[PDB]
Design a protein around this ligand. Structure first.
Ligand SMILES: Nc1ncnc2c1ncn2[C@@H]1O[C@@H]2COP(=O)(O)O[C@H]2[C@H]1O
Ligand SMILES: Nc1ncnc2c1ncn2[C@@H]1O[C@@H]2COP(=O)(O)O[C@H]2[C@H]1O
Ligand SMILES: Nc1ncnc2c1ncn2[C@@H]1O[C@@H]2COP(=O)(O)O[C@H]2[C@H]1O
Lengths: 203, 200
C-alpha cells in the first residue's frame, strides 16, 4: 500500500462503505451517478451473455477507482457488474461532487485517467487473446499472467498460483469441464502441475 | 470550439494518404495525435500478421493517448489511415503543460477513453461468447442495423468486403468466404457479391 495528501483530500469528500466478500457493489444497467475508490480489498469486474454466462474483465484492487465510465456524460448506465472478491472498504462520491474536486485540483483526474488508459491497454490485449488464441492457449496464457502476479508463491519446479476451474473458465470463456480437460492436457505435456485448486506453472 | 482551436494551435498538423501507417505498435510513445480530418483503423495482429481491428476513429478523435500517463511505454497497436487524413500532433510534455492551463482538454480526452473502454469491453464479451460463425453473423446483423444499411425487399442490404469482415472478427478472408456460403446455404443471407442481403 501507499497514500498521499492528494488522495486523503479526495477521500475526505467520500463516504466509506463495507462490502463482504461476494457482495455486488455495482449492477450492470444501473444509472451511473457515483464514482468509487477501493480503500481496501479486491473486486472482479464482469459481464454476462443472454444465457447468464459470466466473463471476468478485470480484477481491481486497493487504490483502484471503480464506476468511472459514466463520469463524462450524464444518463449512462453501469457497463458491467462489480463484485467483491474479498471483504472490501470502498469510498464513494457523486459524479457532481467529483467534478467540483477536479476543478480544485486536476491531478485527481490525472490519476483516474492513468487507470483508464491502463485498463484500455489490458482490455485490448484481452481482445487479441480471445481473437487469436484457442481455448488452450488462452488458458496457457492466463496461467502465465497469474504466475507473474504479486500473489505468486515460489516453488522448486517453478512458480505457483491458486485458482479454480470455474475462475479460469470465466476468464477465458469456457466451461469448468473444458478447463479440467485442458489442465490435464497441459499437465501431460509437462507444463504444469495441478494439486486440487493449486497450480504449479513450470518456468 | 475555443478549447479545440487553442489546443490545435500548439500542435503541428500533417497530411497522411489513405493506407499509410500513423502509429506502429511497439514504438516509444511520446506524442499525442488528434484527427482533424479523415478516419483511421486501430489494429492488432497475431504472430503471423493476421489482423484484427479494435476500433475506427474519426475526426475529433484523439489517438496515441495510451502512453500519456507513464513514461517509457510503447504504442499498444498499429493505427492506419482508412481515408486521407489530416492529423494534429503534439508531444506528451507539451500536452501536460496544456492540461495545467486548462484541464477541460484532459476531460475531453478522458471522455473518449471511457467510451473506448465501454465499447472494447462489449467486444471482449462477443469474442468470449460467440464462435467465428457467431461473430460473423453478429457483425452482419450489426451492420444491417447501421444508419447506412440500405432497404432491400428481403431484409437489409450492406456493403462490406470479405477482408473487412475478417478484420472485424479476427479471421482470414478465406474463412469469411466459407462461412458466408454456409450462411447463404442456411437461407440467412444472400451474398450477391455487389452486396450482402441480411434477410428479415
Ligand atoms: N474493461 C474494463 N477494465 C476495467 N474496469 C472495467 C472494464 N469495464 C468496466 N469496468 C469497471 O466496471 C465498472 C462498472 O460501471 P461503470 O461503467 O460506471 O465503470 C466501470 C469500470 O469501473
Ligand atoms: N463461451 C463460454 N462457454 C461456457 N462457459 C462460458 C463461456 N464464456 C464464459 N463462460 C462462463 O465461464 C464459467 C466458468 O465455469 P462454469 O462452467 O461453472 O460456468 C462458466 C460460464 O458462466
Ligand atoms: N481498444 C482501443 N480502442 C480505441 N483506440 C485504441 C484501442 N487500443 C488502442 N487504441 C489506440 O491505438 C493507439 C496506438 O498507440 P497508443 O498506445 O499510444 O494509443 C492508442 C490508442 O489511441
Amino acid at each position: 500500500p501507499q497514500t498521499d495528501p492528494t488522495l486523503e483530500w479526495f477521500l475526505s469528500h467520500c463516504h466509506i462503505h463495507k462490502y463482504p466478500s461476494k457482495s455486488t457493489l455495482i449492477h450492470q444497467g444501473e444509472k451511473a451517478e457515483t464514482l468509487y475508490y477501493i480503500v481496501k480489498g479486491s473486486v472482479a469486474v464482469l459481464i454476462k451473455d443472454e444465457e447468464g454466462k459470466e466473463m471476468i474483465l478485470f480484477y481491481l484492487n486497493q487504490g483502484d477507482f471503480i464506476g468511472e465510465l459514466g463520469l463524462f456524460e450524464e444518463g449512462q448506465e453501469r457497463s458491467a457488474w462489480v463484485r467483491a472478491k474479498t471483504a472490501c472498504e470502498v469510498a464513494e462520491i457523486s459524479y457532481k461532487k467529483f467534478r467540483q474536486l477536479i476543478q480544485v485540483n486536476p491531478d485527481i483526474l490525472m490519476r483516474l485517467s492513468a487507470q483508464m488508459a491502463r485498463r484500455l491497454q489490458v482490455t485490448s490485449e484481452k481482445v487479441g487473446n480471445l481473437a487469436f488464441l484457442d481455448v488452450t492457449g488462452r488458458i496457457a496464457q492466463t496461467l502465465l499472467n497469474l504466475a507473474k502476479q504479486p500473489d505468486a508463491m515460489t516453488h522448486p519446479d517453478g512458480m505457483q498460483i491458486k485458482i479454480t476451474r470455474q475462475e479460469i473458465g470465466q476468464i477465458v470463456g469456457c466451461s469448468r469441464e473444458t478447463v479440467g480437460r485442458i489442465l490435464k492436457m497441459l499437465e501431460d505435456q509437462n507444463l504444469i502441475s495441478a494439486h486440487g485448486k493449486t497450480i504449479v506453472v513450470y518456468g
